[PDB]
Design a protein around this nucleic acid. Structure first.
Ligand SMILES: [Mg+2]
Ligand SMILES: [Mg+2]
Lengths: 205, 33, 206, 38, 28, 27, 91, 49, 247, 62, 134, 128, 42
RNA sequence: CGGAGCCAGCGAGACCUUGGCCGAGAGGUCUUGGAAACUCCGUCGUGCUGGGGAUAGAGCAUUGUAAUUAUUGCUCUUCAACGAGGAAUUCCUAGUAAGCGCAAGUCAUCAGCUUGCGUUGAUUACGUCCCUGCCCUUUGUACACACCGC
């Protein structure tokens, strides 16, 4: 649904052919294309904001799509999935190109650097990996498993140290300077890392 | 299957079955003479 | 002031040649040619003639055909080697291209004491046509740096190949002579002649 | 002797003429077996 | 046997996974 | 009707087997 | 259809969605009791989530992603049996 | 038969030349066992096969 | 991931079996594979060939591409059938068409419908390519009108449904291009004409290519699966083979 | 002497001939002064062209 | 601890071929100057003097790699392409080479057929392998 | 038990299995020294990991690599991938985590295909 | 709710004259319904 | 051209074979069980030349079959057309073009042909509607904003 926050009205509703459950969303910088992803379809649906019609379905992910984001400047679309891969879509233009980059593990979260030149992904192995979008190569990595604080649940029959329930971050975001990432997940910690130095700035309970 | 099988699994199992339907010894003598 | 990261002399159960324990210090092409001093003389060709990442051998199995300008990031020696395998009978045989390039670099060092990689870079810089024609008659236009690099590699390799196609000269020695002449800028090289002809035709129709 | 299988047909002018008569009648009546939007 | 080879779950787990010529026979 | 059906623009020789078949029918 | 829900819906149908029951059908566990012990011990994940509640009912979309947790000593045993245990994955 | 590839087999001694085979291509045939077959094509080498 | 495909095959085979019983009970609509998207989503078609095609098969593959409005030609160099099918599923392709030849003569044509089938195999006869016409000109690529003639048996309805959905839904009423599939004793004649409505009838001009196709196999699965259940197969050695008709 | 000019804009919908692109370039010597040129190869912003003549102004080549 | 595996294949074969020629005890058949080593070849070996000894060194190294070897395996091993046939090498030369080596004691009749690397021969090969390093 | 790890490297049909255990710097491929790996013109490829991180890290380990399948080039790439992954895994399991991170950073900065499998899965570039 | 609890990874809370107060409103109080209409609508 | 080094993946309805001995080879005889391309070192050297192997002669053998019949291989000698292809023309964007071998003939088609399998692996473009051709629109109808206005 599109909401006009000057007049506080839902002026348009977008839906698939078969009632797909959407988990993630991305909007073009021009505000003319909106994209959504699902845990059950593996295809990224694209609509026209002005018309509300399905343009087409970006296909290529083998696993459910976890997260989407347009570059605020370059207007490229990055999608990551439990397929252990990230795909960069050049949907605008006379020709469509896709660039898949492999990752060691399922991708849970994704963030576009405000410059639009790099993308960070958080994986299930507890890693934050930074890739250069134009060259499609990794430029940095951060470990996060040791920094994360997770408590033993009262129902647990295994210790917290041995526990692996949530030692990854399900959400990450760049600072608008581009030098920091704030991360959180299904745990009792919000970790703030410094991207260029790949060190933890601070941890919040 | 302690709790049974669903309809698709029952169809699958039936299909597979049809295709499927389609101390002297212990010892040994050595150094014979 | 000193920094020491190793307190024990390293001898491995598997013997390794000494030249390799020299290679660990710096990456050199074929463990014989350094990229440290190589510079592209022409400013425009910088960012399209990549010599900043050293490589031991041309074979890299890289992905450069995916996106429009990835070829700019490919090492220039590897682009030369790839251009070296054509005319059908040589399609797909890249080890021979690598060996021929190795022999050519040895020849270039032998004739001229200057660094052969620098000779290759200077030849590619000199033999890039800066202005061309398009069929309207003809009309003169400028040429993109990537097109200059592509045409330079194509002209050098094609001239070398045609020179030794039916001659006692081998592919390696004729490639060395072509590169040396192009670096000198002498008209002897076929590529320099073609570049001058293209620019003259364009100037006529300017 | 007998043959095991149907012979491959031969496209003679009469076969064409009869076929194009079927096509022309179908276009005349606008009788097309073509998919339609649901 | 070809489907069983095809649709095999790699996560399947079983506890069993944890576990003179005359003279040679005579010696063994 | 005859000009606009090249298969019986003109087709290359050998595409049609009408001449052979009609001879067999006469025989 | 609505009519079939009168008779199709049965307790056995719901019991079949039970995580230990799904695990047994997947051959991950030899017996339902074995599956419950593994779930309690934290060796089982449904998607990116570790599930330690044997009472959890698996939806059809998530059925494909029930697997062993990466560092489980069990999953090491499976790979070791095949001689396919790759230490770079830490599993 | 002298060469058998599952359903395909090469047959000899029925015909003396490939020109006789051409007349009977597509003919019905059978074995003494009753397996039915067809004359597909004449082998150029040797004659009659 | 293989797990989802393994599950969906069991559901697909179960659905076809059930649909067969309901049909037989009715004996005493659009097929389940096409039912979801029939008239909703236009097809995405890939036309490929066997490995190392001759120049003629490539020319014929280009002509089959122009027959279908939403078809794209792909080079098959070194591609493996599991990878070719898996790549097509990833890319949203709906139907895959593979062509075979013998010394530059098209011999066979197989159609596989994604994600789960069916796979239909034809044999090509009397193929006359538009390259065999001099000064032919360029085709018209509008959504054509379809004619399916003399398809009566349930298998004939199955064949029509498979071929019908290779085209887009809803051609314009005044579209001047018509593609005809005429069944004549199980030999489907395929012609392509452009017509002009005259003041006393209709005049048609043939575009090409010409060929006859005869179905000889139809399986419940994609072309990669050689173990797929056979929905229908053509018996050649039965004693009524030389006169029996099926479509 | 030959001048160097960096591309700042790839002009679109110019009606140019196939294979030719119309671009706007700024001279390195004088960053402000700009000229419109016709280029032949694949061109993008921020790349430098060697102009043999700096006085000619590009005209559409159809 | 030096082994034939520690040495480059050609370097060992060149060194051990020279040793056999220098040793002079290897029996060489009279026809070595008239044969091609394979009917797929067009010419005899150019190194007429020492190609046989080099064959012996090459064969002896293969015995060390693989414990049991026979003439049939050597024929395919030294065979090559000629449609094509992939004809196997000449059986006469390989049989003579195997018979000549075991006169020196380098190899000997393996049980269940074939030739084994003799323990005296194994030290002899390892001796020359250490020579190449040193 | 002696500490050890084992890893796999792949390239097309070529598969290399590396065993990295505590030792004295004995690096072998198919039972022979890595210095004998052929073709010689691509030998430095298998040297690339060793030279990037230094021979200093190998002085305390023994690596045994067994390669099967594929061709000469693909086997070279499988060998280098397996060696790099084996070194990283060994430093993870039996050495500190900081050294593992440094190794990953160096290998990734030089050539990511040393660590992540390079599979050119078919892609219908033409949408449609 | 009952089915959600069984198939939910995380906790699921149980769902919940005189003039009545509306605690939650679809628009700001200062905003008027007239200002919610476009000129084309009027 | 001569040596030497070596790396695949498809494939299972007596005949296969590991091994010994003869023969230069082709191929014989006596017994057991049921890949090329490519890389290294050498010879040759711009000469229709150590490129090419058609035609022809002489021999050594295999296979049936009953003939001095062909069949299929091997050895030597003989040593041609062919010097990169006219007017025109077909195709083609990444594991792609092209090179290389191997296997199976699994109801149509295919028999040195059909299909599959792996090995080696690029140049160029990935922009434009300027030309050609094929289409679409010229009642916004389209839910806010903005833009547009027969
Ligand atoms: Mg090809
Ligand atoms: Mg073919």
């Amino acid at each position: 649904r599109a909401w006009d926050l000057i007049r506080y009205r839902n002026f348009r509703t977008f839906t698939g052919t078969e009632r797909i459950q959407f988990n993630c969303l991305a909007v073009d910088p021009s505000g003319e294309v909106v994209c959504a992803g699902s845990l059950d379809n593996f295809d990224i649906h694209v609509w026209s904001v002005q018309t509300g019609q399905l343009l087409d379905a970006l296909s290529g992910h083998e696993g459910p799509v976890s997260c989407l984001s347009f570059s605020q400047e370059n207007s490229v679309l990055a999608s990551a999935s439990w397929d252990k891969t990230i795909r960069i879509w050049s949907i605008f233009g006379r020709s469509q190109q896709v660039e898949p980059i492999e990752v060691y593990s399922d991708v849970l979260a994704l963030s576009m650097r405000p410059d639009g030149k790099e993308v960070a992904v958080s994986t299930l192995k507890g890693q934050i990996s930074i890739f250069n979008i134009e060259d499609a190569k990794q430029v940095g990595n951060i470990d996060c498993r040791k920094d994360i604080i997770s408590g033993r649940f009262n129902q647990d029959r295994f210790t917290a140290k041995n526990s692996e329930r949530s030692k990854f971050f399900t959400t990450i975001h760049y600072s608008f300077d581009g030098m920091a990432i704030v991360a959180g997940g299904n745990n009792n910690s919000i970790c703030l890392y410094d991207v260029p130095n790949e060190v933890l700035l601070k941890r919040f309970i | 299957n302690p709790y049974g099988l669903n309809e698709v699994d029952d169809f699958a199992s039936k299909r597979e079955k049809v295709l499927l339907g389609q101390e002297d010894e212990d010892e040994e003598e050595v150094l014979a003479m | 002031f000193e920094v020491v990261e190793e307190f024990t002399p390293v001898v491995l159960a598997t013997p390794i040649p000494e030249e390799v324990q020299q290679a660990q210090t710096e990456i050199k092409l074929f463990n014989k040619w350094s990229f440290e001093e190589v510079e592209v003389k022409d400013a425009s060709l910088v960012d399209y003639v990549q010599v900043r990442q050293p490589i031991f051998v041309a074979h890299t199995a890289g992905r450069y055909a995916n996106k429009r300008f990835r070829k700019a990031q490919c090492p220039i020696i590897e682009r030369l080697t790839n251009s070296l395998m054509m005319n059908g009978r040589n399609n797909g045989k890249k080890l021979k291209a690598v060996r021929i390039i190795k022999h050519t670099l040895d020849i270039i060092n032998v004739l001229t004491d200057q660094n052969p990689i620098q000779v290759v870079v200077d030849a590619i810089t000199n033999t890039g046509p800066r202005e061309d024609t398009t069929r309207v008659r003809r009309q003169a236009v400028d040429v993109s740096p990537l097109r200059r690099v592509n045409q330079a590699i194509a002209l050098l390799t094609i001239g070398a190949r045609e020179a030794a196609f039916r001659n006692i000269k081998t592919i390696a020695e004729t490639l060395a002579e072509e590169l040396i002449n192009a670096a000198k800028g002498s008209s002897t090289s076929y590529a320099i002649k073609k570049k001058d002809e293209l620019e003259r035709v364009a100037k006529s129709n300017r | 002797f007998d043959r095991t299988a149907k012979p491959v047909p031969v496209i003679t002018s009469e076969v064409t003429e009869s076929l194009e008569d079927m096509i022309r009648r179908r276009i005349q009546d606008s009788n097309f077996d073509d998919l339609q939007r649901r | 046997l070809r489907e069983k080879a095809k649709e095999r779950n790699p996560d399947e787990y079983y506890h069993a996974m944890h576990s003179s010529m005359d003279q040679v026979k005579l010696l063994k | 009707r005859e000009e606009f059906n090249p298969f019986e623009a003109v087709g290359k020789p050998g595409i049609s087997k009408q001449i052979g078949e009609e001879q067999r029918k006469r025989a | 259809k609505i009519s079939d829900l009168e008779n199709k819906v049965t307790v056995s149908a719901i019991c079949r969605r039970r995580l230990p029951v799904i695990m047994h059908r997947l051959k991950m566990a030899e017996t339902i009791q074995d599956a419950v012990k593994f779930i309690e011990q934290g060796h089982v994940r449904v998607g990116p989530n570790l599930i330690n509640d044997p009472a959890y009912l698996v939806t059809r979309n998530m059925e494909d992603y029930v697997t062993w947790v990466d560092n489980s000593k069990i999953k090491k045993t499976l790979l070791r049996y095949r001689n396919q245990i790759d230490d770079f994955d830490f599993s | 038969p002298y060469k058998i590839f599952k359903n395909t087999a090469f047959i000899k001694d029925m015909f003396s030349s490939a020109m006789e085979v051409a007349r009977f291509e597509g003919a019905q045939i059978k074995t003494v066992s009753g397996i039915r077959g067809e004359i597909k094509r004449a082998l150029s080498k040797p004659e009659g096969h | 991931m293989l797990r989802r495909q393994a599950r969906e095959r069991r559901e697909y085979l179960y659905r076809k079996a059930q649909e067969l019983q309901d049909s037989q009970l009715q004996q005493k609509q659009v097929d389940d594979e096409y039912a979801a998207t029939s008239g909703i989503m236009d097809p995405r078609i890939i036309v490929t060939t066997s490995r190392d095609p001759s120049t003629r098969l490539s020319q014929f593959a280009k002509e089959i591409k122009l027959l279908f409005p939403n078809a794209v030609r792909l080079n098959r160099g070194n591609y493996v059938m599991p990878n070719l099918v898996d790549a097509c599923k990833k890319s949203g392709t709906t139907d895959l068409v593979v062509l075979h030849e013998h010394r530059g003569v098209p011999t066979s044509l197989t159609i596989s419908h994604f994600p789960h089938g069916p796979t239909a195999q034809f044999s090509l006869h009397n193929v006359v390519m538009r390259h065999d016409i001099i000064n032919a000109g360029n085709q018209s690529e509008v959504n054509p009108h379809l004619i399916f003639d003399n398809f009566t048996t349930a298998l004939g309805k199955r064949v029509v449904c498979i071929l019908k959905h290779l085209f887009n839904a809803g051609p314009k009423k005044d579209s001047e291009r018509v593609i005809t599939f005429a069944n004549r004793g199980d030999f489907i004649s395929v012609r392509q004409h452009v017509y002009v409505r005259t003041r006393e009838g209709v005049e048609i001009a043939e575009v090409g290519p010409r060929f006859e196709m005869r179905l000889f196999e139809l399986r419940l699965g994609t072309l990669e699966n050689k173990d797929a259940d056979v929905e229908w197969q053509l018996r050649r050695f039965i004693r009524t083979a030389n006169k029996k008709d099926y479509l | 002497p030959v001048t160097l000019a960096k591309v700042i804009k790839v002009l679109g919908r110019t009606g140019s001939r196939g294979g030719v692109t119309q671009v706007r370039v700024e001279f390195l010597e004088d960053t402000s002064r700009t000229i419109v040129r016709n280029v032949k190869g694949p061109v993008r912003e921020n790349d430098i062209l060697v102009l043999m003549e700096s006085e000619r102004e590009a005209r559409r080549l159809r | 601890g030096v082994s034939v595996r520690d040495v480059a294949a050609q370097d060992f074969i060149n060194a051990y071929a020279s040793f056999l020629q220098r040793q002079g005890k290897l029996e060489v058949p009279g026809y070595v100057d008239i044969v091609k080593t394979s009917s797929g070849n067009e010419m005899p070996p150019q190194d007429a003097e020492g190609w046989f000894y080099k064959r012996a060194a090459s064969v002896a190294r293969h015995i060390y790699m693989r414990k049991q070897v026979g003439v049939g395996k050597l024929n395919k091993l030294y065979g090559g392409a000629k449609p094509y046939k992939h004809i196997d090498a000449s059986g006469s030369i390989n049989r003579k080479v195997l018979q000549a080596l075991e006169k020196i004691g380098i190899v000997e009749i393996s049980p269940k057929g074939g030739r084994r690397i003799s323990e005296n021969g194994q030290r002899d090969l390892d001796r020359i392998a250490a020579q190449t390093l040193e | 038990a002696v500490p050890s790890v084992q890893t796999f490297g792949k390239k097309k049909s070529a598969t290399a299995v590396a065993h990295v255990k505590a030792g004295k710097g004995l690096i072998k491929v198919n039972g022979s020294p890595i210095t004998l790996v052929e073709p010689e013109i691509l030998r430095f490829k298998v040297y690339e990991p060793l030279l990037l991180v230094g021979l200093d890290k190998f002085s305390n380990i023994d690596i045994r690599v067994r390669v099967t399948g594929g061709g000469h080039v693909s086997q070279v790439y499988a060998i280098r991938q397996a060696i790099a992954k084996g070194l990283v895994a060994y430093h993870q399991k039996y050495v500190d985590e900081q050294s593992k991170n440094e190794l990953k950073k160096a290998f990734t900065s030089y050539d990511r295909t040393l660590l992540i499998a390079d599979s050119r899965r078919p892609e219908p570039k033409k949408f449609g | 709710y009952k089915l959600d609890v069984l198939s939910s990874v995380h906790f699921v809370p149980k769902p919940a004259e005189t003039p009545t107060i509306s605690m939650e409103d679809a628009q700001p109080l200062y905003m008027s319904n007239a200002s919610s209409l476009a000129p084309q609508e009027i």
